[PDB]
């Protein structure tokens, strides 16, 4: 560099070390003054990083160099100057640099290796030498560069690179070892699989180098390696098959060694568990995984109240978790997660081997652990455990009265967890065992923690319990809970209110009995602490719904005044109990809520208008932004962003409430429609960073319209704006799941708005979207390895609904646009994948409903007649509906196919009468009835397919036909066929039947409804003329 340039830059970069003022003045100077100067700047910084004897200036420059070299970008730099930079960087790397500075140089160097940059063979050469150096920092930094630039691994000869890694794993220095493993795993995460087979052979060397960490007592570094291995299991789990037992045994060995600090034990557990989430067939196929996993997690769950056998510290504290019981926490999460992926088929047996034993230990911690373990595994193993239910209770329930209060707590928990996981069956079956067990723990004989947890477990039970089942136990439950309500400890009171609330909600009308006593107790609590009052308001309004409006009106006025007070006064946890309560009052009050809207809606508007609160951010400026629970950072197109997740979640919550107020208030909500639609719903579709928002936006639309419609041009303006943005969203929406919501949204919009609600350019725009969606679905299904082991059906189901909706609103005229995507529809019809076939068949049936299709008759009847006798009942269903609809709307143009196939329909109609394909064969039945109407042996066949109970449109036709086959000793089958249809709520046919019964003796007539029980004879009486 020119000598002047140097001291200019030297001064500025020295201003960087320091204060805001001196350091911002330097920042300005650089960003304002320094495409004319970039290569000088780059050259300067690279020289500083390489040669400056000042640590701080050196570091700074290296970091700056890295930042500015991406921004440049490095590609657009003069070959002449790249070379100089590369050489000085390399010279600095190979000189005497402090460890931290070599790291930064390494990362700068990485910025100068790029596929389209001129070849840099000096780097390869310097790395090969450095890996052989006796200075650990040279070795570490070399693997680091191969971590950042993994493609360099491909550029080295295979017979050099393999020994490089084997040496890496084996190195004297732990830091070198960590860097080699990082680099090794990094390889897999940056290169295509076609390249993997080339380092894969090394996994054994890596695994074999593991026990050495334990020998050296270097378990903290073991944890780092376990973390790289965790990533490798996600990428290439199969690679570990057949060294499988050796990693399993090794992690077993480590987890059991309980004077290791926990990091190495918890990461080893994570390694174990992650296999089940990435290679379930593998873990299932070896008995040893399940066994080690269960054994190991049971041990860890024992690690509670350490050095505190009485649990003194725990009885005194609140019912929140002591998050300092880390290994215990990890163990239950693990057991849960594995159980979920492998199922009970695979782990009930090993689990129970160990439970039996620990249940009876004299170590309380083990009896506890057994409860917590069952409790963790229960969801996952539901499939098997749902039928070992009395056996479970026999083991669990004795401990309800265990000497030790934590075992008691433990027992309450299992009863709670199980009540949820085995619902609704367990409510029906075990109330006689469960409720008394729990109720007995409510008494003030027991400790605060246990009483509260028993009360907690009662919520779990109640969620899925019948009012009828709970009824005999209410008095007992209530009297006990009232005691806890008076407890002296905040948390006991709070749980008591919540338990009462949720019991009440289940009890419904059976709770009316208890209302007069409870409600003033509740009012007094309110008049007297945010969670208490919120939990109290929640309890009051849940009680209010359970008892109904009239009864709730005894205190509603006062309650409402307290709500208002609470809302407008000087925890954000309260805001929610308030919101949900107002909303619950509106479900109780019906139209009487309307006066309250001006209290309740304004705060919801504010929240529901939160903008996409985004920070276009920088690489380092992330990991710290990531610290916050309330924030998450993602990458859009390489360049990153910080999104305030909490705020966006809150927007959704508020939109949900706006949506339910609209749904219940209907016409009454009309005053808000324009505001919510334009300032909330619609802008929400452009929230590309949060799909909940986008979805809530779409579901709001038709509900808003329907509200304005019921009250009253603006409706049209709004609808036009809305439908347009939905349609345009169909082409640009990346998530198929959201795409489905838009279509469903349009269908609902169309049903609200009625006839011809869409314009011609809209219809064309909807077709491109439909086409893009059909295109992207085909391409995803043409997807499905050496290393690895309904959202599409649902989307297509909805697209069928939108197309039908659009056809109906246009009354056929959409057939013109429909021609453009016939190639799509055709490919589908003759693919193999049954889902695409069903889609196309269903579209086809819609086309025919609107004799102008002959154009195509020749193209799809061959496939339809195939489909008729497919193994797949959903295919037969779609096909027969098509044939039925052919005869109905296009009778002369399809007379030739319909009558031939008529025999096929008599055959398909005869597994037919099952639940699973009752659907299919009911359509066939209706299909033949349709044909017999459009154009005697056949009709007698048809009859032997009644009654029709599952499909509504089919049933509609068959009994219309049955009514014509009459008005223009089968008599008890005739009547029954009809009674069954009504009774099963599938579908004037009655008028025809009356006349038939007229033509019989009074005693013959009466004997038909000999068979029928009282409840359906109550209904029969109220059906007849």
From Swiss-Prot:
HEAT repeat feature ranges: 3-34, 38-72, 79-112, 121-148, 158-190, 199-235, 243-278, 287-342, 344-378, 382-422, 424-464, 467-507, 509-547, 550-589, 591-665, 668-711, 714-753, 760-810, 813-850, 857-889, 897-935, 936-967, 970-999, 1002-1025
UniProt subcellular location: Cytoplasm; Nucleus
Transmembrane segments: none
Phosphothreonine sites (modified residues): 791
Single GO MF descriptor: nuclear import signal receptor activity
GO biological process: mRNA export from nucleus; protein import into nucleus; regulation of mitotic nuclear division; regulation of protein desumoylation
Function per UniProt: Functions in nuclear protein import as nuclear transport receptor. Serves as receptor for classical and arginine/glycine-rich nuclear localization signals (cNLS and rg-NLS) in cargo substrates. Its predominant cargo substrate seems to be ribosomal proteins and ribosome biogenesis trans- and cis-acting factors. Required for nuclear transport of YAP1, NOP1 and SOF1. Mediates the nuclear import of histones H3 and H4. Mediates docking of the importin/substrate complex to the nuclear pore complex (NPC) through binding to repeat-containing nucleoporins. Plays a role in protein secretion.
Subunit structure: Interacts with Ran (GSP1); interacts specifically with the GTP-bound form of Ran (GTP-Ran), protecting it from GTP hydrolysis and nucleotide exchange. Interacts with RPL25; this interaction is dissociated by binding to Ran-GTP. Interacts with YAP1; this interaction is dissociated by binding to Ran-GTP. Interacts with NOP1; via its rg-NLS. Interacts with SOF1; via its cNLS. Interacts with histones H3 and H4; via their NLS. Interacts with ABF1.
Protein family: Belongs to the importin beta family. Importin beta-3 subfamily.
Additional remarks: Present with 15500 molecules/cell in log phase SD medium.
Protein name listed in UniProt: Importin subunit beta-3
Gene source species: Saccharomyces cerevisiae (strain ATCC 204508 / S288c)
């Amino acid at each position: 560099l020119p000598e002047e340039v140097n001291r200019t830059l030297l001064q500025i970069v020295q201003a960087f070390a320091s204060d805001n003022q001196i350091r911002s003045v330097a920042e300005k100077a650089l960003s304002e003054e320094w495409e004319n100067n970039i290569e000088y700047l780059l050259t300067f910084l690279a020289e500083q990083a390489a040669f400056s004897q000042d640590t701080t200036v050196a570091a700074l420059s290296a970091v700056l160099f890295r930042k500015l070299a991406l921004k440049a970008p490095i590609t657009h730099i003069r070959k002449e100057v790249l070379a100089q930079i590369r050489s000085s960087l390399l010279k600095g790397f190979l000189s005497e640099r402090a460890d931290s500075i070599r790291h930064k140089l390494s990362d700068a160097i990485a910025e100068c290796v790029q596929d389209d940059l001129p070849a840099w063979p000096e780097l390869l050469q310097a790395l090969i030498e450095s890996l052989k150096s006796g200075n650990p920092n040279f070795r570490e930094s070399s693997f680091r560069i191969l971590t950042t630039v993994p493609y360099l691994i491909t550029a080295v000869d295979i017979n050099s690179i393999l020994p490089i890694f084997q040496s890496g794993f084996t190195d004297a220095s732990d830091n070198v070892k960590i860097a080699a493993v990082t680099a090794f795993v990094g390889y897999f995460k940056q290169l295509p699989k076609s390249e993997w087979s080339k380092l894969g052979i090394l996994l054994p060397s890596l695994l074999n180098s593991l026990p050495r960490f334990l020998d050296d007592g270097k378990d903290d570094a073991l944890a780092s390696v376990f973390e790289s291995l965790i990533e490798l299991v996600e990428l290439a789990p199969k690679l570990f098959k057949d060294m499988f037992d050796q990693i399993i045994q090794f992690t077993d060995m480590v987890i059991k060694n309980k004077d290791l600090e926990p990091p190495a034990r918890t990461t080893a557990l994570e390694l174990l568990t992650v296999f089940s989430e990435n290679a379930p067939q593998m873990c299932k196929s070896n008995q040893n995984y399940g066994q080690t996993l269960v054994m190991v997690t049971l041990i860890m769950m024992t690690e509670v109240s350490i050095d505190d056998d009485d649990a003194a510290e725990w009885i005194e504290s609140d019912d929140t978790d002591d998050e300092e019981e880390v290994t215990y926490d990890h163990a239950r999460q693990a057991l849960d997660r594995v159980a979920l992926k492998l199922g009970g088929e695979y782990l009930a047996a090993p689990l129970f081997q160990y439970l039996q034993q620990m249940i009876t230990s004299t170590e309380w911690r083990e009896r506890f652990a057994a409860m917590m373990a069952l409790s963790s595994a229960a969801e996952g193993c539901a499939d098997v455990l749902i039928g070992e239910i009395p056996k479970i209770l026999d083991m669990v329930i004795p401990l309800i009265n265990d000497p030790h209060p934590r075992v008691q707590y433990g027992c309450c928990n299992v009863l709670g967890q199980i009540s949820t996981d085995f619902s609704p069956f367990i409510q029906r079956t075990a109330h006689d065992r469960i409720l008394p067990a729990l109720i007995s723990k409510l008494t003030s004989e027991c400790t605060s923690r246990v009483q509260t947890h028993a009360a907690a477990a009662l919520v779990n039970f109640s969620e899925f319990a019948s009012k009828d089942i709970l009824e005999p136990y209410l008095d007992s439950l209530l009297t006990n809970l009232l005691v806890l309500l008076q407890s002296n400890k905040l948390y006991v009171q709070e749980q008591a209110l919540t338990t009462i609330a949720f019991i009440a909600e289940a009890a419904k009308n059976k709770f009316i009995k208890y209302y007069d006593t409870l409600m003033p107790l509740l009012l007094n609590v309110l008049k007297v602490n945010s969670v208490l009052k919120g939990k109290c308001m929640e309890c009051a309004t849940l009680i209010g719904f359970a008892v109904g409006k009239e009864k709730f009106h005894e205190h509603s006025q006062e309650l409402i005044s307290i709500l208002v007070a609470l809302q407008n006064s000087d925890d954000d946890a309260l805001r929610s109990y308030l919101e949900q309560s107002w909303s619950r009052i509106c479900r109780i009050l019906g139209d009487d809520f309307v006066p309250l809207l001006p209290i309740v809606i304004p705060p919801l508007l504010i929240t529901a208008k939160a903008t996409q609160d985004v920070g276009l951010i920088e690489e380092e400026e992330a990991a710290n932004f990531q610290q916050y629970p309330d924030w998450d950072v993602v990458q859009v197109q390489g360049k990153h962003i910080a999104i305030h997740t909490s705020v966006l979640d809150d927007k959704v919550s508020a939109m949900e409430l706006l949506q339910s107020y609209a749904t219940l208030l209907r016409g009454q909500f009309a005053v808000y429609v324009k505001e919510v639609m334009e300032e909330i719903a619609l802008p929400s579709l452009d929230f590309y960073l949060h799909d909940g928002v986008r979805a809530a936006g779409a579901t709001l639309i038709p509900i808003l319209l329907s509200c304005l419609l019921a009250a009253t041009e603006e409706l049209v303006l709004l609808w036009h704006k809305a439908s347009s943005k939905l349609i345009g969203g169909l082409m640009s929406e990346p998530m198929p799941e959201i795409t489905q919501v838009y279509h469903n949204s349009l269908v609902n919009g169309i049903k609200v708005m009625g006839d011809n609600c869409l314009s011609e350019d809209q219809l064309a725009a909807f077709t491109k979207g439909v086409s893009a969606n059909l295109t992207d679905t085909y391409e995803r299904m043409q997807d499905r390895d050496e290393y690895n082991e309904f959202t599409d059906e649902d989307l297509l189901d909805e697209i069928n609904k939108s197309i039908a909706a659009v056809l109906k609103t246009t009354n056929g005229h959409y057939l013109k646009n429909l021609e453009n995507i016939w190639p799509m529809i055709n490919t589908f019809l003759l693919d193999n994948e049954p889902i695409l076939v069903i889609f196309a068949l269903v579209v086809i049936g819609d086309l025919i409903q609107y004799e102008q299709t002959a154009s195509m008759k020749n193209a799809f009847i061959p496939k339809v007649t195939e489909c008729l006798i497919s193994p797949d009942a959903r295919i037969r269903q779609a096909a027969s509906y098509i044939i039925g609809v052919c005869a109905q709307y296009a009778p002369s143009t399809y007379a030739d196919v319909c009558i031939p196939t008529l025999d096929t329909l008599v055959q398909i109609v005869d597994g037919s009468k099952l639940e699973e394909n009752r659907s299919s064969t009911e359509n066939a039945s209706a299909a033949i009835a349709k044909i017999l109407y459009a154009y005697d042996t056949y009709t007698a066949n048809w009859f032997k397919t009644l009654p029709t109970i599952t499909d509504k449109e089919a049933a509609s036709f068959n009994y219309q036909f049955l009514s014509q086959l009459i008005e223009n000793s089968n008599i008890s089958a005739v009547v029954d066929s009809v009674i069954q249809a009504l009774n099963e709520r599938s579908l004037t046919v009655i008028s025809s039947v009356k006349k038939l019964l007229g033509f019989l003796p009074s005693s013959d007539a009466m004997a038909i409804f000999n068979r029928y029980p009282a409840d359906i004879m109550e209904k029969v009486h109220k059906w007849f003329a």
